[PDB]
């Protein structure tokens, strides 16, 4: 199952405060409008490669 990740996956690259300024940063990020794999927890949990970091989106209401 494939899905289109529009613009998610941005994190504060550092612990430095700023205010009202454009900053350019080269770092590890999730490309925009990407293909994200979608998995179902019904009749699984397959082992997956790490490959230099990973994103994870969970939307499960039940604990």
């Amino acid at each position: 199952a494939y899905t289109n990740s529009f613009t998610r996956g941005v994190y504060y690259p550092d612990k430095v405060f700023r205010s009202s300024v454009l900053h350019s940063t080269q770092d590890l990020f999730l490309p925009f409008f990407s293909n994200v794999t979608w998995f179902h927890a019904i009749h699984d949990n397959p082992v997956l490669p790490f490959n230099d970091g990973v994103y994870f989106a969970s939307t499960e209401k039940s604990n």
Binding site: K15, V16, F17, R18, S19, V21
Partner: protein, 183 residues
């Protein structure tokens, strides 16, 4: 905690997210630091400094000179002319003389007058001084005259005088050359 610097510490009103440690504005100029003991934010301001200049009427007329500190407040004047920096013997100039506050800094050794003339020693921001004791005042642009305008009158001259004026223009400089091996 490792970040070292110099300046003056002031209270700050900025707000930080719970995970930053120090802030900056541009070009790696750290400006806001939070104290780890109390978790209170403080602001860094560079310690005051500036240039100094001397106003003199020429040693021929006399030898009394006024001093101008550029871009500094009055309160920083006495603490900057102390007996350990900037010619300790100038500490006497740090007081006594009527200190004057302008937009170009602070002036010491010159009086202030309410009049206005066409001066000859510019200072800045419309203020300039002259020897008359050295006195500093505001620029006076010139004498003001009102021409009586009326829609049925003229003014026609009756006598002409001719005059001669001089103008100087440079046209060339010295012709020079330089070698390489000899240098």
């Amino acid at each position: 905690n490792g970040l070292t610097g110099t300046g003056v510490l002031t209270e700050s009103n900025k707000k930080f997210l719970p995970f930053q440690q120090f802030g900056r504005d541009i070009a790696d100029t750290t400006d806001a630091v939070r104290d780890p003991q109390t978790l209170e934010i403080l602001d860094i301001t560079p310690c005051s400094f500036g240039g100094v200049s001397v106003i003199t009427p020429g040693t021929n007329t006399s030898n009394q000179v006024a001093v101008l500190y550029q871009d500094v407040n009055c309160t920083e004047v006495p603490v900057a002319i102390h007996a350990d920096q900037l010619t300790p013997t100038w500490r006497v100039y740090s007081t006594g003389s009527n200190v004057f506050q302008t937009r170009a800094g602070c002036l010491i050794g010159a009086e202030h007058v309410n009049n206005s003339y066409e001066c000859d020693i510019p200072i800045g921001a419309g203020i300039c001084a002259s020897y008359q004791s050295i006195i500093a005042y505001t620029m006076s642009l010139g004498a003001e005259n009102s021409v009586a305008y009326s829609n049925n009158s003229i003014a026609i001259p009756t006598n002409f005088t001719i005059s001669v004026t001089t103008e100087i223009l440079p046209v060339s400089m010295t012709k020079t050359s330089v070698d390489c091996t000899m240098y």
